[PDB]
Amino acid sequence: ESARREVESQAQQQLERAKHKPVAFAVRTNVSYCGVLDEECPVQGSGVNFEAKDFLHIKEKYSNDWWIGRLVKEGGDIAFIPSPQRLESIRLKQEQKARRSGNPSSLSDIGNRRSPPPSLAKQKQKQAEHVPPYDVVPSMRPVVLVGPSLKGYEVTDMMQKALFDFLKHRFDGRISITRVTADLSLAKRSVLNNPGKRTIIERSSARSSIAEVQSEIERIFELAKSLQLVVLDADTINHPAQLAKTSLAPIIVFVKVSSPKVLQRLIRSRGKSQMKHLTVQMMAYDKLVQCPPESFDVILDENQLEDACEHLAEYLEVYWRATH
């Protein structure tokens, strides 16, 4: 059959034609699969071996079955990533190799109860949660700083503003800094079809701040579409788990202190105003440090300003370089 060879050649030519075009968007993969093993790929032998919690950069459109993407890792070449429909099809194919999928067990009972598979055995049911196989995530993961005390208070304010100023000075002309006054912890996606479309209905949620939260969500999305690095100065995040399940899922940068005694002496050197909230700051620091480090993306145990600043510097540099 010359048709398969001809379509392979056409797809390849389109690949090197669009290799140097701007990227459209990006998504995240929450399932582990290999794009080289499947026989439905337009190009065979050039699949991507992505795993759970992986990111790809989609530039153009191919069909309702496959897309063209790029590996976020440094040196990643071109690859094909299946469409959400194709991913659902391969997920269904994953569990069809078993003896049974529905209710009728194969415990030495064959020929008596045929039990044809009902709708409960298919994907039509199980719609209570329906976690999407592909999520519309921002192209770049935003940079946020967490700890070691509450946001909006002195100790965290200085200890994060120093690093923000360092990043602004070192990345001049290629980075943008913005502050998100509105809340960001309620970045949900499957609450309702349209919660509070108009603000004049005077409903319970019409007069609330959900509209501002959503508007800031699309603002962050379109800002990340620009491919320019942007850090967040929002002072409404205080725990990795608050925004870990949301769509944004920012890069959590955790700064830590060896013992609470050092922090106690630090606030002891500030004044009585921070001494008043010393108790709540210690409580929040203890709660934040009880969390295992793997929840946070990067860790900063360095005592000195330089080591931490330059460390986040090469981390951001390699994140920028690997993306391109």
Binding site: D157, M158, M159, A162, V257, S259, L266, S269
Partner: peptide, 14 residues
């Protein structure tokens, strides 16, 4: 530890 943190909260914004 305090030596690297006392200046951290001093020359950053204060």
């Amino acid at each position: 530890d305090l030596k690297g943190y006392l200046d951290w909260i001093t020359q950053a914004e204060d």
